[PDB]
Amino acid sequence: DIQMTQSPSALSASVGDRVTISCRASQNIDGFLAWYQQKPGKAPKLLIYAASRLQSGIPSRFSGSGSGTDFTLTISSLQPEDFAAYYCQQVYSAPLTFGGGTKVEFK
Amino acid sequence: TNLCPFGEVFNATRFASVYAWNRKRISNCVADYSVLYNSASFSTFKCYGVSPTKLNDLCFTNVYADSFVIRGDEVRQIAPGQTGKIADYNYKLPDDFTGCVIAWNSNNLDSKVGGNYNYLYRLFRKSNLKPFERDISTEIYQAGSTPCNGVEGFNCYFPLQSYGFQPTNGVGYQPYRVVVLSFELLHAPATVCGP
Amino acid sequence: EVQLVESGGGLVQPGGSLRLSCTASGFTFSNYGFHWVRQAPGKGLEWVTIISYDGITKHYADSVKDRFTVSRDNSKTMVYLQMNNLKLDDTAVYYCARDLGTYDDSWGQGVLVTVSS
């Protein structure tokens, strides 16, 4: 099994701030990491795939970085819409595991 | 200050299948090939008839970019005068070819748990493919003397076989994104010189 | 446009059996593998199972392994998550996804499954 640790869960920031979300894999998963944004009572939306590749129709502000066991998700400029839960899921292993979850909240 | 759309070819979200390879004509633009070499994220950057470094001075009339995904083992087969399953029935490079074959590992892009079905290399063809010839036919292969009659049967096989691309697969079996650049040097405008 | 719709989610008793059918439209169903993800109320996402494009290969998380069976019918373009030996913990919104964490990623709206005694 592979285990994803997503910190900081309680991150807060004002609009226009730069946010960083870090996900750590227990063992090497190459570049097989995905970033999702879940608004309340809505299905998850895939912001990033293949660690750094932005999905089509996603705003350019979202960005991903890292490889191996360490990864990062960065929002260049925060927005009101961006205040939602964020999840990191590894796809390398046969049983996929999601991250804890980080709730970006208005300050 | 027109610039060639290498970014579209190299950074496309999905590459085409090797049997259904995608050919893009590039013209009327300046291309900095050296910038691509400087990035050096490509496992294979082999140029035939031209040197990979310093080819800016040379002027090319017709540049064609061919994009497909193959296994790591097949990258050797994407070369002039090479014999393989991929060379014989999927993509053929002419013996006199002048151009550059660029291949990079795309394991994290083109792999899914349980395998990805999209790539689908051709397994059976009656005759070897001619250079720069694409076959997209799905007609049943008559290995046996008995006619298939358009239906799968004993000794009758579907032509296209799907590559199973897994994250756990070895480097040889991992997906590789291949862009083949074909340069033509003739007496013509030579617009895509790319100094 | 790729569309996934989850149906069959409803109230069930503990130890009961419920099956969730994921209707698919706008794409070739056979080509792409499918996933099931559940979000428990006030909890994070939890991947449940995967069925491959061929359908021979199936993988389940331990928390549902030997209790949940994943199946698909290509002709009907539906993926069925059979659920057995249901528990109060199992209560969640079950989302059906296509090729998670890839360029082919798609998600259904989700269907709430409630286990109550």
Numbering used by the authors:
A (entry chain L): 1 to 107
B (entry chain I): 333 to 527
C (entry chain G): 1 to 117
From the article:
Here, we combine monoclonal antibody (mAb) isolation with deep B cell receptor (BCR) repertoire sequencing of rhesus macaques immunized with prefusion-stabilized spike glycoprotein. To further examine B cell evolution influencing neutralization capability, we focused on lineage 10644.
To further understand the role of SHM, we investigated the interaction between mAb 23 and a D614G-derived prefusion-stabilized spike by cryo-EM. Residue Y53 from the HCDR2 and adjacent LC residues Y49 and A50 also contributed to the binding. RBD residues interacting with HCDR3 (R346, K444, N450 and Y451) or with the IGKV1-NL_15 LC (T345 and N440) were outside of the hACE2 binding footprint, while S494, the only residue within the hACE2 footprint, interacted with the HCDR2. Interestingly, N440K did not impact cross-neutralization against Omicron, while R346T likely contributes to the loss in potency against BA.2.75.2.
